[PDB]
Structure 1
Amino acid sequence: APSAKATAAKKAVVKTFRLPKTLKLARAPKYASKAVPHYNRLDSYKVIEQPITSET
């Protein structure tokens, strides 16, 4: 027989997938593309253009 204890001693001597939800960083640009904010495109005054004085 090989004396399995000797074999153990010899061994000791010798020795559905899917895209994981990875962390996503939110946008944090170093600078704003249009830092200077734009004024109201359609303010209250611009909503009403001209009065209508038709007799009807």
Structure 2
Amino acid sequence: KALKVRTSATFRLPKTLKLARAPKYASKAVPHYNRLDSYKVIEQPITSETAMKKVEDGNILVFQVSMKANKYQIKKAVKELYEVDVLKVNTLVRPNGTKKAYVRLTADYDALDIANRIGYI
């Protein structure tokens, strides 16, 4: 039995086989329901006269929103609920601690129309 050649003065850890798991029991026993869905990301609209002006003029909608959301989820959620292509979405956190989403739609839609469709103005 002879030796082996070596070109480097280094020894490094061999690249053994990195196994993957074979669990004998699933961890938590339930696939947790979707923590975040449309009905959770959108709490309600917003009522103030400023919002009324924005919906009247800019073809914009103003929703109160979960602080765990983002614009991707909001766009998807509004598409789901109200069937309204939203163009852009802008957000802030109101100092009473809650997310506020302005939502600019597209000219195929009228925010006032869908607002009275919802029921509120």
* TM range, smaller chain: 0.5 to 0.7
CA-based RMSD: 0.9
CA distance in 1 between counterparts of 2:17 and 2:39 reads: 46
Structure 2: which 5+ runs fail to align? 1-9, 51-121
Runs of at least 4 residues off by over 4 Å: none
Q: Which residue is equivalent to 1:32? A: 26
Residue 47 of structure 2 corresponds to residue 53 of structure 1: yes
Normalized per residue, the structure richer in strand is 2
Q: How many residues align?
A: 41
- TM-score, normalised to structure 1, is 0.66
Among 17, 36, 40, the alignment partner of 1:23 is 17
Q: What TM-score, normalized to structure 2?
A: 0.33
Cα distance per residue 1:4-54 (max 9 Å; x no partner): xxxxxxxxxxxx110000012101111111121100111111010011010
The sequence identity of aligned pairs, in percent, is 100
Larger radius of gyration: 1
